[PDB]
Structures are given as C-alpha cells and as structure tokens.
C-alpha cells in the first residue's frame, strides 16, 4: 500500500464542492459592495440628497 | 445489423425555437429533447409514424 | 537626415526609399512572391489509404 | 455589514457573555460550542455550526466558546473533550444536555426541536 | 491579513488588492497633485479641494453597461472654489470631473460594453545598477546607471584614472571633473572626505527616484538619506564613484539585471493612477483654457462651467482602447478568464519590446522562483516576453514579487505565523529546502542532508542549517501547469504547451468532471465567477431554469442565470442551477455552475475509453481515430453563438429584384425571425442606403436572439451552431498530447476491450516516447480505475516525495482495486500492468501485443471554431523544379494583374506580353525617385531595339 | 513536416496547359524521390510504417 493515504486523493463522483471548506479562501465580496462598506463609495441616494441639498 | 424505433423530430406549437424557455416548464426546451431523445420504443414494423403528448 | 521629420504623434515619415528598402518595401514582399488567386487554406488530414 | 454580509454567524463569546446570555431570558434554544483553535476536530465542527446557524436564522441561537480564553470556565463547566457543545432551554426547569465529539448535523437539529 | 499564508490566495487578489489601494490611496495621492489655477492675478481663483472627493455609484448595473454597450464606471465629485477678487467674493460649488471605470470583483473592466482585463508588467526597478562593458576593442569599463520612475538612464563609467563620463544621451557624453558645482552642489568640500580625490585633479524628467528608488539607493550605497525624501542628492551621485572605484579594485560584485530584486511589477493599480494623472494634466489645461474664454468674453460662471467630463472619461477610454496592456477578456473557457488577469508583460509602454530583447529576459532566473512559473512562457508577442504569477505569488508593498515560505524557527518565541512572504531580494540570503523530513539514521534528524537553494545556487546541507521550507505543492507554478495531472512526469516543455492547450478548451453542451485531476479545479471554476455564488445566506426558496429565489436574514435575493450568451471568442456561456428547493446555503457557496463547470469544479473535456496503438496509420504522428459514439452520443457537441452587427439608410421588409430564397425570413422592418434556421447567404437584415447583410460561409443554424438598439439604429442577431465533434478538429488531453481527428470509425470495427466495450478514440503510442510525458500513461490507467469503483481523483503534484514510485504505487493500487471489486481480470494484468489484450473490431481476432487502455481527459480545441500568399521560398522551389511557367503563373493573371485575369476567366470557360502591375507599380515608385528603369527588347532577327511600355 | 496537431495548406490548380504539363511531367513525387543534397531517398517509411 501506498504511504500516502489514497483516501486523500478520493473524491465521490458527485460533489458540489462547497467553497467554505478549510482549503478555500474567505468568499470574495462584490467590489461595489466593499468600497460601500469601506465608505469610499457613496450610495446614489446620498448623491441625490447632497445634490439636492445645493439646489436651494 | 439490428434496427430500433426511437423518436425522431418534435413539434412544438408557441415557442419561437429550441432553446427559448416555456413559463412553467423547469426544464429548457432543449432539456426536452434530450429527454425525448432518452426515451426507449419497441416497434417491429416500419415507417413514420405519428405520437402525441398533449 | 540627420534630424529626420517627425509627425505631431511623433512617427517617423516613411520617404520614397523607405517605400523600397525594408520587406514591406514594394521590392521583396510584392515582387517575390504574390496574393496567388485559386487558394485554398485548410486543416488537413491523414490520407493512409 | 450593511452591503457586505458577515460570513460567520456563530457568534463568539466570553465566559461573561454566556453567563448573562443563560441568566437572562433567552425564547429560543441556546447552543453553546466549545473548541480551540489548534483542535483538529473542531475544524470540521465549526463548518457544521455555520451550516446549523443558516438553517435556524432566528429559532436558535448558536454561540462558541474559545477554551483558550476561557479554559478555567470551560473545566467548571464539565468539558472532558473539545469537541463538546451544550444545548441550552430556553424553559429554566429544563436541563441542558451536553454532547461530546462530532455528533452527526442530523442529530443536532434533532436535539433542537425534540428536547427544546 | 493571513490571506496566502494558509490556503491557496485568490487568483483574482492581485487585481482585487491593486484597484482597492487606487481607490483607497491613488486618488487623492493624484488629487493632491492637482495644482491652483491663475493668470497673474485677476478676478479669478481656482483650485479643487482634496479632502472633499466623492465617489457615487454607477446607475447601471454591470449587465445593463455591457447590454447597453456603456462603461461601468463611477463618479468623481470634488468640492471646487472659486473667487472673483473684484468682487472679493467666494463661489462654492460641489462640481463633477468625470468617471472613473470601476472593475467587478473577477478582475474585469467594461468600457464601452466590452469585457476587458489590466494585465501586469514588469519593469527594472528604480535605483543604482553596477554593470561591466565592453567597446569595439575591450575596455571592460564599469558602469554605474542610475534609473528613476520616469526610465531615467543616467550613466556613469569610469575610464580607471581618466574622467567618469556622466551622459544623459549617446550624445550628452560629459564628464563630471567641472560638474562638481552641476546643478546646485559644491566644489571640493566633501569630495575629498571619501577615497582620493586625485581624480578630479534634467530638472524633472529624470531628478528623482521616487518611493522605490531612495530605498534601492540607499540599499547598495549604504546612505544616511531618510526615505521621506524623494529627490536625488549630489551625494548619492558622490556615492555612486564611491562603490564603483571598489569594483575595480575586486571589492563588492556587478548587479544582475535579470534578477527579480531590480525589477518592479506594476499592476492595475499603478496604471489608473497613471491615467489618472494625465487626466488632471489635461484637465488643469481645460481650465486654464476656460479662463481665458470665460475673461474673453467676461461672463461670471459657475466652478462647473470651468470644467467638463472630457478629460477624465477620454483618457480611460483611450487608455483600454489603446494601451496594448488592457487587453480583451479571453472568455473562451473559466480557465481564460482567470489565467489572463495574471500574465506579466515585458515589453509595453517603457517596457523591452521584440527590439530590445536579448535573450537573458527571455531565461528562467532563481529568483522566478515561487513568483513566475518556469514552465508557463506562453509565447505570445514574443518568446519568453510574458510570463505569468506563480499561484502563490504576492504584490509586495515595493512592488515586489513575494511567494510564502515555512519558517523553521528555532526556539524563537511562539513564532506566531510561521509563513513568510519573501521578496526576491532576501529570497536569496536564507536556505530554502524542498525536502521532506522522513530520513532517519543512528543518529539524529538534524543532521540528515536535504537538497536546498542558496545564494541562486542548489546544494545539500543537512535539517539544522535550513531557515525556510517550500511546502505548499502548487508553490512554483502558474494555474495552467497545476491542472496537469502527474506533471513530474511530464517534460517540462510539454507542460508548457499543456497550459496553452487548456486555454483552446471549448467548453461542451454537458460538461463533465474529470476523473483524474489535481485539485486546482476547485479554485479555477471558483475564482472564474463563471458559477453562480450566494453572497447572502439562507434558504432556497425557488430554483429554475432562469432565476434563483433565496431567503435569508428576513431578505430574498432573485438570482438571475445565464442561458445562451455569447462569449467574446463566440462560445455559449450557460448557467445551470445545482441548488434544490428548500435547502440552506451558507455565504459564498455554489447555487448554479456556469458552462465547462460541473458542480464547482472546471469541466473542460470527457473522459472517454481510449487505447495506445497504431491503426492502419489512422492516428499517424498526432491524429487520432475517434468512434461514432462521440459523435451520436453528443460527447464532444458544443454550442457556439455568432454575433452579427451592421451600424447605420433605411431598413426595409424585402429588396426588389430578389426572390424568396433569401427574404423568406426577413420581417416587418427587415430583420430575421426570432428563431428561423438560416443558411449561408440568405439575408439577415435588408437594409437600402442612397448595403445588407448576408450569413456568411461556414456561418449556419438557429437564430436566437435579435436586439434593435437605436441617432443610426444597431442590429444584432446571434446564432446558435450546434457543432459536434468531427474530422479535422482538434483534440487534446492535458499532458500536451494533442491531435487531430482523421477518421471516424463505427462502433463494431472500433478495438474493444475483453468486456466486449469498444475504446472511443484510438491515439498513436510512438508519441509518448519522443514527447516525453508519461503523465497520461498514468492518467490513463487512473481513469479506468476510477470509472470502474466510482471514484474522482484530485492528487497533487509531486506526490514522489512522500516515496519513490508513489504514482507508480497508486495507480497500480486502483487499477487491481478496480480488478477486484468489479471483478475486471483484464483491467489488472499481473503479466504487464496497466494494460490488456485487445481485440480487433473488424476480424475479432486479439492483438498479440497488450495495449494501455483507460479514460484519460480529452480536451476540444477552439481552432475549427475560431477559424492566400506564395512566399518568397516557394518561388526558389519552383525555380529547383525549372517550372518556369508554373512560377510565371504565380506572378500573373493569379495574381494582381487586371489584364489578364480579366479574360483568363472565358479562356477557361469556352476552352501575357505585358509587364505585370507589381512591376509597373515598381517603376512608378522608382519614377517618383527621379530614376527612369526602361525595359528594352533588343530583337534577335535585325537587332530592331523596341521599348516595351510599363 | 506535416505534423498533425495542427497545419494548414494552400493549394494553387496551375490554369495554362503548359503549367498543367509541367506540374504532372516535373513535380509529380514519383519523379522527385532523391533530395539533391546527396542524393537519398525521401520518401523512407518511418513511424508506425
């Protein structure tokens, strides 16, 4: 028997792969989601708001 | 050497071609082929014949 | 020349001898050799028969 | 975050935190995990509560505990082994039922509605 | 932090990371750049305030841009002042530069509705360059060469005792012996302070070393100067005659240019910023041009009117159009997507172009190492001139390649991370060993020897001296060589073809995982966003063909798919749903997996029985004999869509003086039938300008989808081929066995196994010797082994290290497991391993010989998808036959020659003596150079000289 | 060199009859099986043959 166990490499010929494991990287956000978060991007709404906020 | 009978061609009625998407049905019409295309006949005779699902 | 023309995009004018000196020159690529109507280009196959 | 969702919903918490979290009134089963980082097992563990924590968003509530912050605490608490969760009640009179090792997810919802 | 420390990094983070620091820090650091705007001194200021930048979110959505053939981009607003002095009065207003483009999270910008992707260069570092020359006699004189941000190539070579030239140019040759004083420096005051001074007995566009040139500066010199400061000093030049006088006398070693610790990589990042900078180059000249309009003609305008969206929109455009690094997405597998956001390009803009591309650029260099594959030269430009990351590799803060290594720290604290990410300079100082630590002896394991890599240089030391190990397996390779499968023992140069074949992939109407693979597929299908991910969690509450519904948090998200959307290399990209109703889905899992990916894995190819053996010369060199089964069987079927474009002259119902074999399908305003079958010449739209469109040759099919876009009105009609798998098209595994498809064969003339299963494709055996990749020979088996006990492998590479023969072990271990449980005698013979005694399909007769037999994973390439001149050669064979009327004919009437082809067409429909028009037109050239070339015939019978007119 | 992992030909059909004649009567191969470097043959089996 190999030294290695085969068990490693065996993967049931059905598997959706779920991307959470412990071998995956943490999920990559939308980058129109992060720069919202991160504040670097503000919303239209706000846009509108400060825009109309100058119309007086 | 030995001959076997299985569906040959479909007609649909309101769907403009093979691969457009009927409300309703889960599966593409081209899923539907495929299934069609699946399906297993006995027929010892010969010829076109005629089959419907409505 | 030695300070040869250039255009407002910088690109050296390519002069009449130019025109006959390099391979794009109207010398080698257009004299040796031609565009040879009647071809056909295809992916071909073996024939072991 | 508001834009980007959070992806863990297990909660960690001190041994502080839990307490109130147990003395105060809780209306939906409390499940507390226990596990440590370097535990091998608890790797496998902590993906099976992110997936419980999706299927009750709001009917449990799922919280762990890091024995390396809070081994002491852990020790009073009657843990032999790391990969060990306690299923809380939220009925007072209840006892909490302890399980130890990587208990199938099956028998994990099982616990939730049958005993809770 | 620990992003690439533990698991494998994102293959998109290079391009994440970079757009997040210009979106974080190259905006205002260009935005602060920007300066006041005044004449002299008016009633005018005008200067932008920095602090005040905002950005909003685009209005359409990323497929509404590229529907709509729009840029995604962002909006850029910065608080603007102005004061008009005679009145003394401040104009506040919130004004709009312009767009800033915004890429999605795989890596890709759309600008005008066109996927396209920032590739990444590589660049000499600025700093200090010792480096030998040699003259057209021999001086061996050394050079110092000083390069700045802006390619500065500031020589400096001593002549031993004579003067140290100091030119700027070829033409600038100058000495230093005067230019101690030079720019604003002094006479001998400190020259004398360093060395013997017997010896001695521009403003902006190459000054400063920026950022990343004081460092190298005062990294070989040795220098005081802090890194805040960013000009060049007189003493970093005084210091540079200080280390070179050492050269000469031995002490200190020339700088190796090819080292990656001299070079810089710039990524997505440092470009917009660029573009970024000329935008405000060009926009503080809008303004100073709008000052002098608006004092022209004396109007009192608003902060806005000084400034319009011109510069900052254009340039971007014209920087992805016209930038040779921002390049068209290559979407014709998941693996394209993802492999062409990570090239490295030498040459480009500053770069070493084709010209200047000495062949040591072109040479793998020990500090590639982790940081570029070895295998991946995917010559493209030119050989070896774009490279590609490593999947580990890192984008370091000095834009450095950095590859994590294992720490084997001693006792040193808790060590904390033990992970390293090593740029190439201190790569090169620590004893990094690839080895593993199962020796043992009487002694102890300290002392065991393990090959390791030192100073650029490979040696066995024993355990104790080793600082760092190399233990991730897919450590030194791009994403095209780690989905080959036992790439040990496969060449190297075939490797490097293999990766350039898995980007021909064509992806199938049902994809299919493959049996043997390497466990990268995880990843690829993962980063490609090819598959649909959650990026919320939840329920599903309802799935179907079109749409997705998940429920999470009190919050439903509708998931749209993908169904039948042409790619830019004209492939279906359809997306299928793999999530069933009612089940929970934590954050960032699949819910439908896209075309070539089969549940979250990529899916490029079948496997397919296949046997090792000549065939009646079939799969002679690299054809291969392929079975009806793959053609009936829709194996190989892929689905590739055209799309057809006419810009606008008005669209009309039918053409008059045509008949209805072409205007059978045209509509009430021109256009096809949404989903009539159209073959090669009929009109697709009939249009009549004061011009139509016809379906091309080899064009055919179903047509699906018809957009009327209208300001000229745009059509666009789409087909969709159905093309299976035939003779000429290309077919490869992974291991760089390619081939082409001679014959199809049916199913009972086909070799078959002694289960009485017919093999699907048939490849010749005298490929793998002179190939040299044994890889597939144990894929092959492999296959076999896991079809049978239904089994998929995902093995990393290298798997020798853990013993010897492990490949070898494994696959013979599955090959009898699968002879064994399925009770398969022949799929492991004790006699020869691996393979069998197969029988002729047409005689029934076994062949002596036992075959290899197995389901290897075979590839469908693009070429018969995606897609004349006699060469100067061709005229000195022709010439070597004495063909002369052959050859005369090439140079004729078959060629461009009006005269003659204008009637050699009813010559050879019924049944030369001028010069050709290449000749004519020589002469004209030669005409206009004030040269007169006459051709004269001198006769032979009375010497009667005629001119023969050109 | 015709490899088969890829290769595409162009074919000319010579249109004069004196063209005819000397494609079939001078560069025929069962007229061209000595390469004039030394004078060996060309046409040798070689692989699978």
């Given at each position: 028997?190999?030294?290695?166990?085969?068990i490693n490499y065996i993967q049931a010929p059905d598997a959706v792969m779920d991307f959470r494991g412990p071998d995956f990287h943490e999920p990559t956000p939308n980058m129109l989601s992060y720069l919202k978060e991160n504040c670097?991007?503000?919303?239209?709404?706000?846009?509108?708001?400060?825009?109309?906020?100058?119309?007086? | 050497?030995?001959?076997?009978?299985?569906?040959?061609?479909?007609?649909?009625?309101?769907?403009?071609?093979?691969?457009?998407?009927?409300?309703?049905?889960?599966?593409?019409?081209?899923?539907?082929?495929?299934?069609?295309?699946?399906?297993?006949?006995?027929?010892?005779?010969?010829?076109?014949?005629?089959?419907?699902?409505? | 020349?030695?300070?040869?023309?250039?255009?407002?995009?910088?690109?050296?004018?390519?002069?009449?001898?130019?025109?006959?000196?390099?391979?794009?020159?109207?010398?080698?690529?257009?004299?040796?050799?031609?565009?040879?109507?009647?071809?056909?280009?295809?992916?071909?196959?073996?024939?072991?028969? | 975050?508001?834009?980007?969702?959070?992806?863990?919903?297990?909660?960690?918490?001190?041994?502080?935190?839990?307490?109130?979290?147990?003395?105060?009134?809780?209306?939906?089963?409390?499940?507390?995990?226990?596990?440590?980082?370097?535990?091998?097992?608890?790797?496998?563990?902590?993906?099976?509560?992110?997936?419980?924590?999706?299927?009750?968003?709001?009917?449990?509530?799922?919280?762990?505990?890091?024995?390396?912050?809070?081994?002491?605490?852990?020790?009073?608490?009657?843990?032999?082994?790391?990969?060990?969760?306690?299923?809380?009640?939220?009925?007072?009179?209840?006892?909490?039922?302890?399980?130890?090792?990587?208990?199938?997810?099956?028998?994990?919802?099982?616990?939730?509605?049958?005993?809770? | 932090?620990?992003?690439?420390?533990?698991?494998?990094?994102?293959?998109?983070?290079?391009?994440?990371?970079?757009?997040?620091?210009?979106?974080?820090?190259?905006?205002?650091?260009?935005?602060?750049?920007?300066?006041?705007?005044?004449?002299?001194?008016?009633?005018?200021?005008?200067?932008?305030?920095?602090?005040?930048?905002?950005?909003?979110?685009?209005?359409?959505?990323?497929?509404?841009?590229?529907?709509?053939?729009?840029?995604?981009?962002?909006?850029?607003?910065?608080?603007?002042?102005?004061?008009?002095?005679?009145?003394?009065?401040?104009?506040?207003?919130?004004?709009?530069?312009?767009?800033?483009?915004?890429?999605?999270?795989?890596?890709?910008?759309?600008?005008?509705?066109?996927?396209?992707?920032?590739?990444?260069?590589?660049?000499?570092?600025?700093?200090?360059?010792?480096?030998?020359?040699?003259?057209?006699?021999?001086?061996?004189?050394?050079?110092?060469?000083?390069?700045?941000?802006?390619?500065?190539?500031?020589?400096?070579?001593?002549?031993?005792?004579?003067?140290?030239?100091?030119?700027?140019?070829?033409?600038?040759?100058?000495?230093?012996?005067?230019?101690?004083?030079?720019?604003?420096?002094?006479?001998?005051?400190?020259?004398?302070?360093?060395?013997?001074?017997?010896?001695?007995?521009?403003?902006?566009?190459?000054?400063?070393?920026?950022?990343?040139?004081?460092?190298?500066?005062?990294?070989?010199?040795?220098?005081?100067?802090?890194?805040?400061?960013?000009?060049?000093?007189?003493?970093?030049?005084?210091?540079?005659?200080?280390?070179?006088?050492?050269?000469?006398?031995?002490?200190?070693?020339?700088?190796?240019?090819?080292?990656?610790?001299?070079?810089?990589?710039?990524?997505?990042?440092?470009?917009?910023?660029?573009?970024?900078?000329?935008?405000?180059?060009?926009?503080?000249?809008?303004?100073?041009?709008?000052?002098?309009?608006?004092?022209?003609?004396?109007?009192?305008?608003?902060?806005?009117?000084?400034?319009?969206?011109?510069?900052?929109?254009?340039?971007?455009?014209?920087?992805?159009?016209?930038?040779?690094?921002?390049?068209?997405?290559?979407?014709?597998?998941?693996?394209?997507?993802?492999?062409?956001?990570?090239?490295?390009?030498?040459?480009?803009?500053?770069?070493?172009?084709?010209?200047?591309?000495?062949?040591?650029?072109?040479?793998?260099?020990?500090?590639?190492?982790?940081?570029?594959?070895?295998?991946?030269?995917?010559?493209?430009?030119?050989?070896?001139?774009?490279?590609?990351?490593?999947?580990?590799?890192?984008?370091?803060?000095?834009?450095?390649?950095?590859?994590?290594?294992?720490?084997?720290?001693?006792?040193?604290?808790?060590?904390?991370?033990?992970?390293?990410?090593?740029?190439?300079?201190?790569?090169?100082?620590?004893?990094?060993?690839?080895?593993?630590?199962?020796?043992?002896?009487?002694?102890?394991?300290?002392?065991?020897?393990?090959?390791?890599?030192?100073?650029?240089?490979?040696?066995?030391?024993?355990?104790?001296?080793?600082?760092?190990?190399?233990?991730?397996?897919?450590?030194?390779?791009?994403?095209?060589?780690?989905?080959?499968?036992?790439?040990?023992?496969?060449?190297?140069?075939?490797?490097?073809?293999?990766?350039?074949?898995?980007?021909?992939?064509?992806?199938?109407?049902?994809?299919?995982?493959?049996?043997?693979?390497?466990?990268?597929?995880?990843?690829?299908?993962?980063?490609?966003?090819?598959?649909?991910?959650?990026?919320?969690?939840?329920?599903?509450?309802?799935?179907?063909?079109?749409?997705?519904?998940?429920?999470?948090?009190?919050?439903?998200?509708?998931?749209?798919?993908?169904?039948?959307?042409?790619?830019?290399?004209?492939?279906?990209?359809?997306?299928?749903?793999?999530?069933?109703?009612?089940?929970?889905?934590?954050?960032?899992?699949?819910?439908?997996?896209?075309?070539?990916?089969?549940?979250?894995?990529?899916?490029?190819?079948?496997?397919?029985?296949?046997?090792?053996?000549?065939?009646?010369?079939?799969?002679?060199?690299?054809?291969?004999?392929?079975?009806?089964?793959?053609?009936?069987?829709?194996?190989?079927?892929?689905?590739?869509?055209?799309?057809?474009?006419?810009?606008?002259?008005?669209?009309?119902?039918?053409?008059?003086?045509?008949?209805?074999?072409?205007?059978?399908?045209?509509?009430?305003?021109?256009?096809?039938?949404?989903?009539?079958?159209?073959?090669?010449?009929?009109?697709?739209?009939?249009?009549?300008?004061?011009?139509?469109?016809?379906?091309?040759?080899?064009?055919?099919?179903?047509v699906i989808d018809v957009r009327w876009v209208q300001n000229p009105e745009i059509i666009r009609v789409y087909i969709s081929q159905k093309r299976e798998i035939k003779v000429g098209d290309k077919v490869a595994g992974r291991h760089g066995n390619k081939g082409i498809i001679s014959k199809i064969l049916p199913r009972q003339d086909m070799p078959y196994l002694q289960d009485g299963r017919p093999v699907?494709?048939?490849?010749?055996?005298?490929?793998?010797?002179?190939?040299?990749?044994?890889?597939?020979?144990?894929?092959?088996?492999?296959?076999?082994?896991?079809?049978?006990?239904?089994?998929?492998?995902?093995?990393?590479?290298?798997?020798?290290?853990?013993?010897?023969?492990?490949?070898?072990?494994?696959?013979?271990?599955?090959?009898?497991?699968?002879?064994?449980?399925?009770?398969?005698?022949?799929?492991?013979?004790?006699?020869?391993?691996?393979?069998?005694?197969?029988?002729?399909?047409?005689?029934?007769?076994?062949?002596?010989?036992?075959?290899?037999?197995?389901?290897?994973?075979?590839?469908?390439?693009?070429?018969?998808?995606?897609?004349?001149?006699?060469?100067?050669?061709?005229?000195?064979?022709?010439?070597?036959?004495?063909?002369?009327?052959?050859?005369?004919?090439?140079?004729?009437?078959?060629?461009?020659?009006?005269?003659?082809?204008?009637?050699?067409?009813?010559?050879?429909?019924?049944?030369?003596?001028?010069?050709?028009?290449?000749?004519?037109?020589?002469?004209?050239?030669?005409?206009?150079?004030?040269?007169?070339?006459?051709?004269?015939?001198?006769?032979?019978?009375?010497?009667?000289?005629?001119?023969?007119?050109? | 060199?015709?490899?088969?992992?890829?290769?595409?030909?162009?074919?000319?059909?010579?249109?004069?009859?004196?063209?005819?004649?000397?494609?079939?009567?001078?560069?025929?191969?069962?007229?061209?099986?000595?390469?004039?470097?030394?004078?060996?043959?060309?046409?040798?089996?070689?692989?699978?043959?």
């Amino acid at each position: 028997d190999p030294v290695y166990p085969t068990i490693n490499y065996i993967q049931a010929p059905d598997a959706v792969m779920d991307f959470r494991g412990p071998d995956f990287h943490e999920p990559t956000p939308n980058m129109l989601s992060y720069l919202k978060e991160n504040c670097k991007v503000i919303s239209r709404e706000m846009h509108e708001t400060l825009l109309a906020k100058e119309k007086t | 050497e030995i001959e076997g009978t299985c569906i040959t061609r479909a007609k649909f009625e309101n769907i403009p071609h093979d691969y457009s998407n009927i409300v309703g049905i889960q599966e593409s019409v081209h899923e539907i082929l495929m299934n069609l295309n699946e399906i297993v006949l006995k027929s010892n005779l010969y010829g076109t014949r005629n089959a419907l699902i409505c | 020349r030695g300070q040869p023309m250039r255009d407002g995009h910088n690109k050296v004018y390519k002069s009449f001898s130019d025109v006959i000196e390099g391979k794009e020159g109207r010398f080698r690529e257009t004299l040796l050799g031609k565009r040879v109507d009647y071809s056909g280009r295809s992916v071909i196959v073996v024939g072991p028969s | 975050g508001k834009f980007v969702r959070e992806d863990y919903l297990v909660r960690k918490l001190s041994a502080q935190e839990l307490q109130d979290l147990v003395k105060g009134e809780r209306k939906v089963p409390l499940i507390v995990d226990f596990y440590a980082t370097w535990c091998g097992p608890c790797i496998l563990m902590a993906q099976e509560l992110e997936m419980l924590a999706v299927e009750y968003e709001s009917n449990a509530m799922i919280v762990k505990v890091d024995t390396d912050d809070e081994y002491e605490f852990a020790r009073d608490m009657q843990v032999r082994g790391l990969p060990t969760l306690f299923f809380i009640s939220p009925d007072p009179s209840k006892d909490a039922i302890r399980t130890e090792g990587l208990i199938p997810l099956q028998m994990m919802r099982d616990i939730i509605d049958n005993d809770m | 932090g620990k992003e690439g420390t533990s698991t494998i990094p994102g293959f998109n983070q290079i391009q994440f990371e970079g757009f997040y620091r210009f979106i974080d820090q190259g905006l205002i650091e260009e935005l602060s750049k920007f300066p006041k705007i005044e004449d002299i001194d008016h009633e005018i200021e005008f200067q932008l305030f920095v602090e005040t930048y905002q950005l909003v979110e685009p209005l359409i959505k990323e497929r509404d841009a590229v529907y709509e053939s729009l840029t995604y981009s962002s909006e850029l607003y910065v608080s603007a002042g102005l004061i008009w002095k005679t009145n003394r009065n401040m104009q506040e207003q919130r004004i709009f530069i312009g767009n800033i483009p915004l890429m999605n999270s795989l890596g890709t910008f759309i600008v005008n509705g066109i996927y396209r992707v920032v590739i990444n260069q590589i660049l000499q570092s600025p700093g200090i360059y010792y480096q030998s020359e040699l003259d057209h006699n021999g001086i061996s004189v050394y050079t110092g060469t000083i390069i700045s941000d802006w390619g500065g190539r500031l020589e400096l070579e001593i002549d031993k005792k004579a003067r140290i030239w100091a030119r700027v140019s070829r033409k600038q040759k100058i000495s230093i012996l005067v230019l101690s004083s030079a720019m604003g420096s002094n006479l001998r005051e400190i020259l004398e302070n360093v060395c013997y001074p017997e010896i001695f007995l521009f403003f902006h566009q190459r000054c400063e070393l920026g950022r990343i040139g004081r460092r190298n500066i005062n990294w070989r010199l040795n220098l005081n100067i802090p890194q805040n400061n960013i000009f060049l000093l007189p003493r970093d030049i005084l210091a540079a005659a200080d280390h070179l006088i050492g050269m000469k006398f031995g002490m200190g070693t020339l700088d190796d240019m090819n080292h990656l610790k001299n070079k810089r990589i710039r990524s997505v990042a440092d470009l917009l910023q660029d573009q970024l900078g000329l935008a405000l180059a060009r926009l503080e000249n809008v303004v100073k041009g709008t000052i002098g309009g608006a004092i022209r003609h004396k109007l009192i305008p608003t902060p806005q009117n000084l400034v319009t969206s011109t510069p900052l929109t254009t340039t971007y455009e014209s920087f992805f159009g016209l930038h040779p690094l921002s390049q068209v997405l290559d979407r014709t597998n998941p693996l394209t997507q993802i492999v062409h956001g990570r090239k490295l390009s030498y040459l480009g803009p500053g770069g070493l172009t084709g010209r200047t591309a000495n062949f040591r650029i072109r040479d793998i260099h020990p500090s590639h190492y982790g940081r570029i594959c070895p295998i991946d030269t995917s010559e493209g430009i030119n050989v070896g001139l774009i490279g590609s990351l490593s999947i580990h590799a890192r984008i370091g803060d000095w834009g450095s390649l950095e590859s994590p290594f294992y720490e084997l720290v001693e006792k040193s604290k808790k060590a904390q991370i033990r992970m390293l990410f090593l740029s190439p300079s201190q790569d090169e100082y620590y004893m990094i060993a690839a080895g593993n630590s199962l020796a043992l002896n009487r002694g102890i394991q300290e002392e065991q020897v393990v090959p390791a890599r030192y100073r650029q240089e490979f040696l066995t030391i024993a355990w104790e001296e080793v600082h760092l190990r190399s233990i991730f397996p897919f450590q030194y390779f791009s994403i095209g060589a780690s989905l080959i499968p036992f790439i040990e023992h496969n060449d190297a140069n075939r490797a490097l073809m293999s990766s350039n074949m898995q980007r021909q992939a064509v992806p199938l109407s049902r994809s299919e995982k493959c049996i043997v693979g390497t466990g990268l597929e995880r990843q690829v299908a993962l980063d490609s966003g090819v598959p649909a991910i959650a990026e919320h969690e939840g329920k599903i509450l309802y799935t179907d063909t079109e749409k997705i519904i998940l429920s999470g948090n009190e919050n439903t998200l509708s998931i749209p798919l993908i169904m039948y959307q042409r790619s830019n290399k004209n492939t279906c990209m359809h997306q299928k749903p793999q999530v069933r109703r009612g089940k929970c889905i934590k954050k960032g899992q699949i819910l439908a997996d896209g075309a070539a990916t089969v549940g979250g894995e990529l899916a490029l190819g079948k496997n397919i029985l296949v046997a090792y053996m000549p065939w009646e010369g079939y799969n002679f060199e690299d054809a291969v004999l392929i079975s009806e089964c793959l053609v009936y069987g829709d194996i190989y079927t892929s689905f590739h869509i055209r799309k057809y474009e006419i810009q606008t002259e008005r669209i009309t119902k039918e053409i008059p003086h045509l008949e209805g074999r072409l205007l059978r399908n045209l509509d009430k305003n021109g256009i096809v039938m949404l989903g009539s079958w159209v073959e090669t010449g009929d009109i697709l739209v009939g249009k009549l300008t004061p011009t139509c469109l016809k379906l091309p040759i080899g064009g055919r099919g179903r047509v699906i989808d018809v957009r009327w876009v209208q300001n000229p009105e745009i059509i666009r009609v789409y087909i969709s081929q159905k093309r299976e798998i035939k003779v000429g098209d290309k077919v490869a595994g992974r291991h760089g066995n390619k081939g082409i498809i001679s014959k199809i064969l049916p199913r009972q003339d086909m070799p078959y196994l002694q289960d009485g299963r017919p093999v699907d494709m048939v490849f010749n055996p005298l490929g793998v010797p002179s190939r040299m990749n044994v890889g597939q020979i144990f894929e092959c088996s492999l296959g076999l082994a896991g079809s049978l006990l239904d089994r998929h492998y995902r093995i990393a590479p290298f798997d020798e290290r853990y013993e010897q023969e492990a490949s070898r072990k494994l696959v013979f271990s599955e090959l009898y497991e699968a002879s064994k449980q399925t009770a398969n005698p022949w799929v492991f013979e004790p006699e020869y391993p691996g393979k069998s005694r197969i029988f002729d399909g047409r005689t029934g007769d076994p062949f002596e010989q036992p075959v290899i037999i197995g389901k290897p994973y075979i590839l469908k390439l693009i070429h018969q998808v995606d897609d004349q001149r006699v060469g100067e050669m061709e005229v000195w064979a022709l010439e070597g036959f004495g063909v002369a009327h052959i050859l005369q004919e090439m140079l004729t009437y078959k060629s461009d020659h009006i005269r003659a082809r204008q009637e050699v067409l009813g010559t050879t429909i019924i049944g030369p003596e001028d010069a050709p028009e290449s000749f004519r037109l020589l002469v004209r050239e030669l005409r206009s150079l004030a040269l007169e070339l006459n051709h004269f015939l001198v006769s032979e019978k009375n010497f009667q000289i005629n001119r023969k007119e050109v | 060199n015709a490899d088969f992992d890829g290769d595409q030909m162009a074919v000319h059909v010579p249109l004069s009859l004196e063209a005819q004649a000397e494609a079939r009567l001078l560069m025929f191969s069962h007229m061209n099986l000595l390469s004039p470097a030394i004078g060996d043959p060309i046409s040798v089996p070689t692989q699978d043959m």
